[PDB]
Every structure is written in structure tokens, then in C-alpha cells.
């Protein structure tokens, strides 16, 4: 909300959370060793999906540049 | 699946050639370019089949020149 | 500096930048936006093809411009 009053405020905090989910992903993964079987994969995935995704419709209040962010971040 | 990796990413090399010189790391990266859509080889094949074209004589290097190739018929 | 970018979606989009920053560097940004791989991409800024390892300094990019990206191009 502070950052969305200041003009240009919202693009770092865009990265920020692009950045962040992206790593959390990423490191997520890791956990699940060389079996590769895919239906931890998945779940893993939308376990953070999830979380993510209501935290941008609710705090954030469901701003499409977010939105954006993430599903750029989740692909 | 890979064997056939080379054949497609051979005939990449051969067709980008023909349509005259170029240098090392133009080639790769269009070789990359054209075969994206079926998938992302690896640089360390591609030389290989670089080697194996020029082999079979489908291209040549320039005599004086850094890293470049002639598309020779 | 946030500067725009014309992808080939049809749409336009802006990313952080400093000017110091290598050229290259927006390409990956540009991957994490729109899915297109740094390796195959060029940038274009105001009818010339953007270099590489140049940075943005060295083309006046200010947070008002714009990027055109396009596929390789090769002469033949």
C-alpha cells in the first residue's frame, strides 16, 4: 500500500517477488531426490502454488501486474 | 532419441549453411534458433556434428580465418 | 530505471534496469516475463541491433525508452 501511493513504487517489489517464489520453487524441488516420480513434483509445486496465489488475492488484493509476476515465475 | 538428435541437428548445420560463411558461434546459435521447437541440444553435440559435416566435406573451415566455415558443395 | 519492452505477443512490457548493467542481462529478464530464451533473442533499440557484453550507458537508454525484441538475423 505504501509503495502503490509513491509513483513507480510497485516494479522492485515485483522482482522481489518474482525473485523469491522462484527460489523457494526451485530449492523446493530439490527435496524430492532421483526417484523423479511426478506425483510429489506436482504436488510440490501446487503446495506453493497455493500459498502464493491466495497471498496475491487477498494481501495484494488481486493486481494483475502480480498475477503476471507469478505465473511467469511458476512457468 | 539421441542418435537421431545428431541426424536432425546435422541436417540443421547442412541446410543453415547452404542458405555461405559463417562464423563458430553465428552457426551454433542458429542451429539453436531452428531447432528449438523440437528441442535444446547441446553445444558439446553440436560440435561434434560440426566435425562429423565437415568430415563428409558438407562444409570446411575458411583457410585464414578465426572460427569460420564455407559451405561447400 | 524501469524501461519498456515490445515483445512479440503483441504487448509491451517493463522491467528494472540500471544503466551500468550488461545488455545481456535485460535478455534474461526479458526470458522471465515472456519464455523466450536469452540465446535466441535480439534486441533492438531505435533501429539498431543492441550488442552484447556493451552496456546500457553505452546506449543512453533512459527509463522512458523502448526495447524492440526480434528473432536472429542473418544476411544471405
Same mark, same amino acid.
Given at each position: 500500500?505504501?509503495?502503490?501511493?509513491?509513483?513507480?513504487?510497485?516494479?522492485?517489489?515485483?522482482?522481489?517477488?518474482?525473485?523469491?517464489?522462484?527460489?523457494?520453487?526451485?530449492?523446493?524441488?530439490?527435496?524430492?531426490?532421483?526417484?523423479?516420480?511426478?506425483?510429489?513434483?506436482?504436488?510440490?509445486?501446487?503446495?506453493?502454488?497455493?500459498?502464493?496465489?491466495?497471498?496475491?488475492?487477498?494481501?495484494?488484493?488481486?493486481?494483475?501486474?502480480?498475477?503476471?509476476?507469478?505465473?511467469?515465475?511458476?512457468? | 532419441?539421441?542418435?537421431?538428435?545428431?541426424?536432425?541437428?546435422?541436417?540443421? =548445420?547442412?541446410? +543453415?549453411? &547452404?542458405?555461405?560463411?559463417?562464423?563458430?558461434?553465428?552457426?551454433?546459435? @542458429?542451429?539453436?534458433?531452428? *531447432?528449438?521447437?523440437?528441442?535444446?541440444?547441446? =553445444?558439446?553435440? +553440436?560440435? &561434434?556434428?560440426?566435425?562429423?559435416?565437415?568430415?563428409?566435406?558438407?562444409? @570446411?573451415?575458411?583457410?585464414? *580465418?578465426?572460427?569460420?566455415?564455407?559451405?561447400?558443395? | 530505471?524501469?524501461?519498456?519492452?515490445?515483445?512479440?505477443?503483441?504487448?509491451?512490457?517493463?522491467?528494472?534496469?540500471?544503466?551500468?548493467?550488461?545488455?545481456?542481462?535485460?535478455?534474461?529478464?526479458?526470458?522471465?516475463?515472456?519464455?523466450?530464451?536469452?540465446?535466441?533473442?535480439?534486441?533492438?533499440?531505435?533501429?539498431?541491433?543492441?550488442?552484447?557484453?556493451?552496456?546500457?550507458?553505452?546506449?543512453?537508454?533512459?527509463?522512458?525508452?523502448?526495447?524492440?525484441?526480434?528473432?536472429?538475423?542473418?544476411?544471405?
Amino acid at each position: 500500500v505504501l509503495l502503490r501511493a509513491v509513483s513507480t513504487g510497485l516494479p522492485h517489489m515485483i522482482q522481489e517477488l518474482q525473485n523469491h517464489i522462484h527460489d523457494e520453487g526451485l530449492r523446493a524441488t530439490s527435496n524430492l531426490t532421483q526417484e523423479n516420480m511426478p506425483t510429489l513434483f506436482v504436488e510440490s509445486v501446487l503446495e506453493v502454488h497455493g500459498k502464493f496465489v491466495q497471498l496475491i488475492n487477498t494481501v495484494l488484493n488481486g493486481d494483475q501486474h502480480f498475477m503476471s509476476a507469478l505465473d511467469k515465475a511458476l512457468t | 532419441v539421441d542418435e537421431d538428435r545428431k541426424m536432425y541437428l546435422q541436417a540443421a =548445420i547442412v541446410r +543453415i549453411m &547452404k542458405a555461405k560463411v559463417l562464423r563458430h558461434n553465428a552457426l551454433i546459435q @542458429e542451429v539453436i534458433s531452428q *531447432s528449438r521447437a523440437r528441442f535444446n541440444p547441446s =553445444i558439446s553435440m +553440436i560440435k &561434434k556434428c560440426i566435425e562429423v559435416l565437415i568430415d563428409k566435406q558438407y562444409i @570446411e573451415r575458411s583457410q585464414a *580465418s578465426a572460427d569460420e566455415y564455407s559451405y561447400v558443395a | 530505471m524501469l524501461i519498456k519492452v515490445k515483445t512479440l505477443t503483441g504487448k509491451e512490457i517493463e522491467i528494472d534496469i540500471e544503466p551500468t548493467d550488461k545488455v545481456e542481462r535485460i535478455k534474461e529478464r526479458v526470458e522471465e516475463k515472456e519464455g523466450i530464451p536469452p540465446q535466441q533473442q535480439r534486441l533492438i533499440y531505435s533501429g539498431k541491433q543492441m550488442n552484447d557484453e556493451k552496456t546500457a550507458a553505452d546506449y543512453k537508454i533512459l527509463g522512458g525508452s523502448v526495447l524492440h525484441l526480434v528473432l536472429a538475423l542473418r544476411g544471405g
